[PDB]
Amino acid sequence: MLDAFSRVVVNSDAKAAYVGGSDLQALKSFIADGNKRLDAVNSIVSNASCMVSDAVSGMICENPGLISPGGNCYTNRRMAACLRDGEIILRYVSYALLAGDASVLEDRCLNGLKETYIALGVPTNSSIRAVSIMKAQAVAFITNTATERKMSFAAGDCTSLASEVASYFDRVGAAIS
Amino acid sequence: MLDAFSRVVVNSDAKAAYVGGSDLQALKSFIADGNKRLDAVNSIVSNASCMVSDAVSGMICENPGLISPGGNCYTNRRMAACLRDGEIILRYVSYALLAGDASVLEDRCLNGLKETYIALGVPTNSSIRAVSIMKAQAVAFITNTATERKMSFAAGDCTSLASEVASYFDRVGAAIS
Amino acid sequence: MLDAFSRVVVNSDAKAAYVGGSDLQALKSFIADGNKRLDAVNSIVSNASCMVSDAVSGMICENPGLISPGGNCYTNRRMAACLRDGEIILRYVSYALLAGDASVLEDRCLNGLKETYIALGVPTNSSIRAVSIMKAQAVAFITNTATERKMSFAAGDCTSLASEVASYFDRVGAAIS
Amino acid sequence: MLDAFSRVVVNSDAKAAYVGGSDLQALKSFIADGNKRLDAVNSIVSNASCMVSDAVSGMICENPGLISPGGNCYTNRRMAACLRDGEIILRYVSYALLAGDASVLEDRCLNGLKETYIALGVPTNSSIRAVSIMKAQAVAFITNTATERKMSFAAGDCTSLASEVASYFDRVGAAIS
Amino acid sequence: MKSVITTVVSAADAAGRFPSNSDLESIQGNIQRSAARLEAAEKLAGNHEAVVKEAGDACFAKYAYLKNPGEAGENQEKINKCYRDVDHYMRLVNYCLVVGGTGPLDEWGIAGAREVYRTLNLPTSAYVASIAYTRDRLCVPRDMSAQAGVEFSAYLDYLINALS
Amino acid sequence: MKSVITTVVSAADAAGRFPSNSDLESIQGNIQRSAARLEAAEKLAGNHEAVVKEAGDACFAKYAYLKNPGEAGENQEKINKCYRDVDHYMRLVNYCLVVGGTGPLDEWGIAGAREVYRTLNLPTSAYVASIAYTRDRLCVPRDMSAQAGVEFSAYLDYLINALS
Amino acid sequence: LTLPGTAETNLAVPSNAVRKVQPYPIAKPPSYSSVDSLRPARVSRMDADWATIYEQVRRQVMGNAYVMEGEAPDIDVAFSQLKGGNLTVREFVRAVGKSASYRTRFMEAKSSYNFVLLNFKHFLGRAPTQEEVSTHIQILATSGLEAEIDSYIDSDEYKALFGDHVVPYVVYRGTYLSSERFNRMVKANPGGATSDKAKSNLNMIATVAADLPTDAIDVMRGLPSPITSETLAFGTAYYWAKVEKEASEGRSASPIGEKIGKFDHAPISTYTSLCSYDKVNKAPQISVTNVGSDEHSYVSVTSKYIAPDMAAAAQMLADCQKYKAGGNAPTGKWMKYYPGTTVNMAPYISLNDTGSDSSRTVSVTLDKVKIS
Ligand SMILES: C=CC1=C(C)[C@@H](Cc2[nH]c(/C=C3N=C(/C=C4\NC(=O)[C@H](C)[C@H]4CC)C(C)=C\3CCC(=O)O)c(CCC(=O)O)c2C)NC1=O
Ligand SMILES: C=CC1=C(C)[C@@H](Cc2[nH]c(/C=C3N=C(/C=C4\NC(=O)[C@H](C)[C@H]4CC)C(C)=C\3CCC(=O)O)c(CCC(=O)O)c2C)NC1=O
Ligand SMILES: C=CC1=C(C)[C@@H](Cc2[nH]c(/C=C3N=C(/C=C4\NC(=O)[C@H](C)[C@H]4CC)C(C)=C\3CCC(=O)O)c(CCC(=O)O)c2C)NC1=O
Ligand SMILES: C=CC1=C(C)[C@@H](Cc2[nH]c(/C=C3N=C(/C=C4\NC(=O)[C@H](C)[C@H]4CC)C(C)=C\3CCC(=O)O)c(CCC(=O)O)c2C)NC1=O
Ligand SMILES: C=CC1=C(C)[C@@H](Cc2[nH]c(/C=C3N=C(/C=C4\NC(=O)[C@H](C)[C@H]4CC)C(C)=C\3CCC(=O)O)c(CCC(=O)O)c2C)NC1=O
Ligand SMILES: C=CC1=C(C)[C@@H](Cc2[nH]c(/C=C3N=C(/C=C4\NC(=O)[C@H](C)[C@H]4CC)C(C)=C\3CCC(=O)O)c(CCC(=O)O)c2C)NC1=O
Ligand SMILES: C=CC1=C(C)[C@@H](Cc2[nH]c(/C=C3N=C(/C=C4\NC(=O)[C@H](C)[C@H]4CC)C(C)=C\3CCC(=O)O)c(CCC(=O)O)c2C)NC1=O
Ligand SMILES: C=CC1=C(C)[C@@H](Cc2[nH]c(/C=C3N=C(/C=C4\NC(=O)[C@H](C)[C@H]4CC)C(C)=C\3CCC(=O)O)c(CCC(=O)O)c2C)NC1=O
Ligand SMILES: C=CC1=C(C)[C@@H](Cc2[nH]c(/C=C3N=C(/C=C4\NC(=O)[C@H](C)[C@H]4CC)C(C)=C\3CCC(=O)O)c(CCC(=O)O)c2C)NC1=O
Ligand SMILES: C=CC1=C(C)[C@@H](Cc2[nH]c(/C=C3N=C(/C=C4\NC(=O)[C@H](C)[C@H]4CC)C(C)=C\3CCC(=O)O)c(CCC(=O)O)c2C)NC1=O
Ligand SMILES: C=CC1=C(C)[C@@H](Cc2[nH]c(/C=C3N=C(/C=C4\NC(=O)[C@H](C)[C@H]4CC)C(C)=C\3CCC(=O)O)c(CCC(=O)O)c2C)NC1=O
Ligand SMILES: C=CC1=C(C)[C@@H](Cc2[nH]c(/C=C3N=C(/C=C4\NC(=O)[C@H](C)[C@H]4CC)C(C)=C\3CCC(=O)O)c(CCC(=O)O)c2C)NC1=O
Ligand SMILES: C=CC1=C(C)[C@@H](Cc2[nH]c(/C=C3N=C(/C=C4\NC(=O)[C@H](C)[C@H]4CC)C(C)=C\3CCC(=O)O)c(CCC(=O)O)c2C)NC1=O
Ligand SMILES: C=CC1=C(C)[C@@H](Cc2[nH]c(/C=C3N=C(/C=C4\NC(=O)[C@H](C)[C@H]4CC)C(C)=C\3CCC(=O)O)c(CCC(=O)O)c2C)NC1=O
């Protein structure tokens, strides 16, 4: 939709201004961590199935009120929905890590997620705890501090992208709160 | 920068308040023990959805007449209101741990709450036990002596922060009684 | 303040009160050697959850008839009620340590304990054995002579408060003799 | 849906009345200007492309806030829509001038035009100006008072049809206001 | 809009999958290409008033008819509207050098040109004469790099091909 | 199949348009990446019999219960079926290192795996025990270059995430 | 592109390789359906010319797209074969839907849930149930775009209603499979001068078709009903309810308030000390990251968070059935109106000055991670 390149044109389209050398170096700075961004998305979708299955079962293991009958994640259909429901959030945050800004998931995934989960009857406080596990493991992979899985990388700093994906995962949490 | 935090928590005309990179160490130099105090709120708000679901269910399993017909947590219009009200106490006390002052907690959260709960018929016998679980739940997460979850931290003592929230939860226990 | 602390106890309802730091130095001046005595309560009640879970477990290993079928600690309704009487001795001797008297211990707790244990079939010769472990546990905590958990302290002598709590624990045991 | 002959039959269906010689001569007068209406519709659709293109550019030339960026007629696609949006207004008033009553445009053109322009962000005060140019030009053609284009007619009265199409162009203005 | 990123992200979403190793491979070209086209953007933004002044009147030099009365250029102010009409086009090819695709040119300058230039009698052959006067005036040693002159010319003839 | 070329030439065709500057730029990424992965394919094709002998048996070292009677491993020949049944996967990682995308991995190895491995009672956990044993044994000094081992690991875990 | 005679492509059912094209368009559905006599007649391939077949495919399948002349050449590819007879109009809307011009105004710009609801509006001309969504939302998860549009065109509901020669339209059939399915179809299909492009969130049928109860509002169904079937009830009676809805349907006023999410709050005079009813249930929404040296741990004030009324149905209804065997041995009658209550000292930790202790009595029960 809007990537990091097209975010600075719609700010400049309202001013009718040509993009010049005062903010092109801010955009040329974004290309300088091009390969730093590129390995970071590859480390996310490397362990993406083990990402969501540790996240939903961790939400179950601290709050075992959904497995009880009458719960939302009780039956075998709704757990298959809930493993799919957290998988779409991982799929669209990975688009925003590739696009560089929260604009693809905002109008597709988050637009109308709040009343979808209210009308179906999703416990919204448990959905905060669902994606907060997916926030703390997304920064665990792209800083490579994951204990059971260590991936080889070229050495350097990557903490600027760690504040990027952690600004996306609470945008999901604010859109569902 | 804390006046930017205090004006957005008394609901002035800002929508939200973001703290940058250079401002974050400027906030850490402002308050005392700025590395541990940001780790204490990060332990609280990561498990806020588990804590108020346990403290309400801890309140029910002590006094089971609340979900009897004639109780206050019968008719789940009311039970979702009591599950809301536990989160609002936890979200205001986690700000007061972050700010270091109880001054936001006394004027935004606690004046007239004794008058509100006698006007709503909320029983003060069980409402103190809702807070007294959440004092013990917050003080176990801070020194990392929770039974199930052991979260990784830089090692050291945090008992000066652990007795800080016990003073802050006692002001909830004073203003409700 | 101590009359306000008397209003916490005697009201026959759940109540809570704190003391601010301006009001705290009046309380340290009114009582004698109060920095030991505020450390005296805080040594006990920070380890109270292990103190009653080891003393009534030590009552079982000296008298295994209570886990016989039909014995008084056989079911978990009775086992949780034995720890519920275990902690409520330990709070009421701690406030008696804190106020420095025993009048709140007799009038609020021990008036009517012999009349309610014989009516409930509680073994009084076994509960005296349970509280004598808690007499022996608290004198290790007040002299920092516990073998597992040793706590940091401003050094000096507090053997006058060691004899003060042993005059409180036998007043429990003489009340149920 | 409803033409001028079928308008009086639903006025007579509510009375269950045979339509007779007390209002057929009011409808025989409608056929007396049968050719006067018939030449009037042809003069609207004669210069129909020059009708709307002068009308939307006259709305631009009095208010250049739309050509400014952020305006609703700034980009090239929106000028292509706004040339076509006012063309459909001409296409349905030419239907209702032929049908003799405002029934064909009130459900195909006006039913739903207000919330489409609200959710798009169309400035409603500018479209009021846009169609009132088309009110002043449609009465300029069927009174043959157009300065740049004069058409030959049989001479006579035509101002009864001038208020007819002017009543239609305030029906499109009321439904958008 | 229609960039190289929005090409591969929407195609990975229309398949309903994660970003695969083809899609991470597509963005790796942009490190090798943004070093050439972004300096063509600031050479356009630092010289945008000259390339509208001495190249917008070349349409009037070729088409000297339309300053006659009764036609598309009547008075002095519509010529001032005309230099505004071509300044948006030079803004948009600056807006597509910074994106990397042809994204901001299509729905903002191209889509709907067959409607508005037919109703308002604006001759598109006089549009493309002014744009192709800018197209053949590129050269290596004066204007930009030898590589940026390929892609700056590669956006201008797409405006020629879409208007004609 | 689903390459970086056939992604951007089908999305240009589904829009119904010419290959624009966004589509021409995506092939420029293949100049910078084919030096890395085509060396990894020659390291895989020159060592394919080794990486199924001392890495296909590691599933049976993890799952010795499969060689029990009444299971998916009964006799000697189904184990000789099994090393062929893993060598077709390592041919397919070789078939997608030279494409650039996950094209030949999907419809030849993935699409339909949930059907044939469930009906014929084959445990997919013992597939991914053999595949991820090859994944963690990559290193820079012995095996390949430093960049080829990133991409060769990036196609293995896609097969783990598809089967699990 | 394929052949000058092609009834069906892609070989989904086995009996389409032998299936002829339909020699004539299919008949209307045989129930009574009082509404459709007021409706305009359906447009087919073999009654009408290409000027109006293209307009009604734009008016129904494209919603109201405003496709330009340089816009949508993929439709101009697919229309140039339909005029040559190279594919039927059933297959033509399959080629319209699989094209990118349908994608770049309904798939990328609308939401994930709204893309299914617009597909039932365009292709089938109705609005789905929740089970029809839940089978269609998995094709967007596992199989993608092209297989999901195959679920409409190769369905038996399409071939019985339209067949190979009839342009899609709102089929009023009178006797429906559900009473909701009439009026959810009608709410999904307004008349002229409405599009789908401004409502990037649709947000009203996205929450009526979400839960299986809470059927939609009556003025949202009296609006697009036909004429001499709405009148004498839309002069000024429901007319202000229509205008107040249109300013809410336009700009997408999100129906947390009045449709679903239905909480009886207390009156404003009941609290009055926690006052200023704009700021009544607001909490600090705090977030920390603590990674490196770029954090932005920004505290926000949150909105008026409501009791969610289903997490309070998980809690307090499913579990907390622990009020069993509550006779609690009523022995020892002198207990002064309290149970076993410890004094509960709880020393607030002695940071050497300006930090002090308070106490509070509470009833104490031992937990379930306790003895043995
Ligand atoms: C097709 C697959 C494919 C990719 C996914 C990318 C991955 C990639 N990354 C780097 C190179 C690098 N990548 C990183 C990134 C990181 N290092 C860390 O320790 C962090 C964990 C992580 C950040 C989140 C760093 C720090 C460098 C070296 C500096 C740099 O070139 O950016 C390089 C070499 C660039 C050079 O040195 O010239 C490549 C080729 N490239 C590919 O061909
Ligand atoms: C009660 C049951 C219970 C669980 C199921 C787990 C679930 C779980 N895992 C982590 C925390 C984590 N989870 C992972 C995930 C993984 N680690 C890997 O190496 C794999 C690739 C992947 C799982 C397959 C990572 C990387 C962390 C961060 C800590 C770490 O590095 O181990 C957290 C903390 C989240 C947070 O800090 O906000 C939780 C709740 N923990 C529990 O207490
Ligand atoms: C500023 C801070 C702030 C708060 C502290 C809460 C305080 C609060 N609670 C309620 C309202 C309520 N609060 C409760 C809560 C409880 N009843 C019990 O038995 C338990 C002890 C307790 C939950 C733990 C209930 C049951 C109601 C609803 C009353 C009713 O419907 O009868 C209301 C009335 C308004 C409404 O609910 O719409 C308010 C202001 N809200 C705030 O904005
Ligand atoms: C064949 C003949 C025969 C017997 C001899 C008794 C034997 C006996 N007594 C008790 C059971 C018991 N016995 C006692 C008695 C005592 N505990 C004390 O602490 C006192 C000092 C002492 C009595 C003076 C108590 C308190 C119980 C448990 C009460 C109960 O089981 O209801 C039980 C357990 C029954 C159960 O599990 O419910 C049995 C089998 N019953 C018989 O059928
Ligand atoms: C049959 C089984 C069996 C037991 C359950 C224990 C029970 C037990 N504990 C202690 C004794 C004690 N128990 C504790 C309690 C604790 N220690 C800590 O550090 C924790 C905080 C806390 C829970 C583990 C302490 C501090 C002492 C004193 C240690 C000492 O005597 O030096 C004593 C000696 C006191 C007395 O006899 O009165 C006994 C019998 N012993 C047993 O033989
Ligand atoms: C706000 C809450 C609050 C507390 C938790 C206590 C905490 C506390 N205790 C002492 C201080 C002390 N505490 C003790 C007590 C003991 N020392 C030992 O080594 C024994 C194990 C134990 C006997 C029971 C002694 C002996 C002193 C020093 C003398 C005194 O000040 O009483 C001091 C003064 C330390 C200093 O300033 O240097 C403080 C703050 N006081 C408070 O106001
Ligand atoms: C298919 C093409 C076609 C038409 C478009 C109509 C046009 C038409 N108009 C009139 C005839 C007329 N038309 C007009 C109308 C007008 N004169 C004016 O000055 C006004 C500008 C304008 C009204 C808006 C008048 C005033 C007459 C003469 C009176 C009359 O016959 O109505 C007549 C002759 C009737 C007669 O005199 O007997 C015809 C044939 N008929 C057609 O066959
Ligand atoms: C970003 C686009 C861009 C341009 C194309 C030029 C456009 C341009 N060229 C010239 C001026 C000129 N331009 C050229 C052309 C060339 N000169 C050479 O050395 C090459 C062989 C050849 C490149 C095609 C020549 C020979 C002149 C001087 C004679 C003249 O004015 O025509 C002038 C007037 C004087 C000046 O400003 O230099 C302008 C505005 N400027 C721009 O900002
Ligand atoms: C196409 C990919 C490919 C591979 C990864 C290897 C895989 C591999 N490695 C070893 C053999 C080995 N592999 C290693 C591992 C390593 N050795 C090092 O220098 C590094 C530190 C570390 C890389 C992770 C070691 C230490 C041995 C010898 C000991 C052993 O046999 O395990 C063997 C058995 C004997 C041999 O042939 O060497 C095989 C098949 N071969 C391949 O064809
Ligand atoms: C996807 C691939 C694809 C194609 C290759 C074309 C192929 C194609 N062309 C036409 C249709 C046609 N194609 C031509 C073209 C020509 N006749 C001549 O005399 C010239 C030699 C030649 C132009 C250079 C003509 C004239 C028609 C219309 C036939 C008619 O009705 O007169 C049709 C039928 C649809 C229609 O009539 O509009 C199709 C499918 N269209 C496609 O969709
Ligand atoms: C297009 C983007 C897109 C999304 C953002 C998600 C959002 C989403 N979730 C569900 C649907 C659901 N989502 C959940 C998920 C959960 N409930 C819980 O208790 C957990 C907290 C959480 C899992 C982490 C459940 C349980 C259902 C099914 C409800 C039911 O029918 O019982 C539905 C309805 C379709 C269906 O029922 O399958 C949608 C649209 N799905 C999408 O397609
Ligand atoms: C951006 C958000 C942000 C945060 C979340 C914190 C995170 C944080 N904490 C510490 C650092 C620390 N954090 C703790 C805290 C604890 N250790 C324990 O054993 C207790 C369980 C717990 C008490 C609550 C301690 C003891 C240190 C070491 C510094 C110190 O002793 O004060 C550090 C510096 C060293 C390190 O990286 O670990 C950082 C960045 N700071 C931030 O800027
Ligand atoms: C105000 C101060 C105060 C107390 C002192 C206690 C006293 C007390 N204990 C019990 C109730 C009980 N107390 C015990 C305790 C014991 N039985 C044993 O075998 C052990 C010797 C001992 C534990 C160590 C048991 C087992 C019950 C439950 C009896 C039953 O359920 O039949 C009851 C009945 C009410 C109830 O529990 O429902 C009361 C008032 N409670 C108080 O509120
Ligand atoms: C019969 C009804 C009944 C209950 C519902 C529970 C309720 C309950 N939980 C805890 C106590 C607690 N509750 C939590 C909270 C959590 N622990 C985790 O590991 C999760 C992350 C998170 C949500 C479950 C923590 C951290 C403690 C303190 C240590 C512990 O017990 O784990 C306490 C002790 C509080 C105190 O001593 O004052 C009680 C009463 N217990 C009961 O007796």
Side-chain angles (χ1 to χ4, degrees), chain G residues 190-241:
Chain G
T194 232
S195 88
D196 298 306
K197 190 255 289 184
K199 305 157 253 287
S200 142
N201 39 9
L202 185 51
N203 268 0
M204 210 44 84
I205 215 162
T207 187
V208 175
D211 56 331
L212 244 111
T214 73
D215 45 354
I217 265 116
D218 46 62
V219 77
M220 271 192 351
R221 275 84 167 277
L223 161 65
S225 282
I227 288 91
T228 126
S229 177
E230 52 84 22
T231 191
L232 245 219
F234 273 91
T236 175
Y238 291 84
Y239 166 68
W240 307 108

Side-chain angles (χ1 to χ4, degrees), chain E residues 84-116:
Chain E
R84 194 206 46 94
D85 275 356
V86 66
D87 188 28
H88 292 177
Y89 275 145
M90 292 278 104
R91 198 153 44 88
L92 279 182
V93 288
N94 183 38
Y95 280 178
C96 288
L97 282 175
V98 62
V99 161
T102 174
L105 183 76
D106 319 312
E107 75 272 0
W108 285 348
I110 294 304
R114 266 147 287 271
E115 273 97 342
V116 291

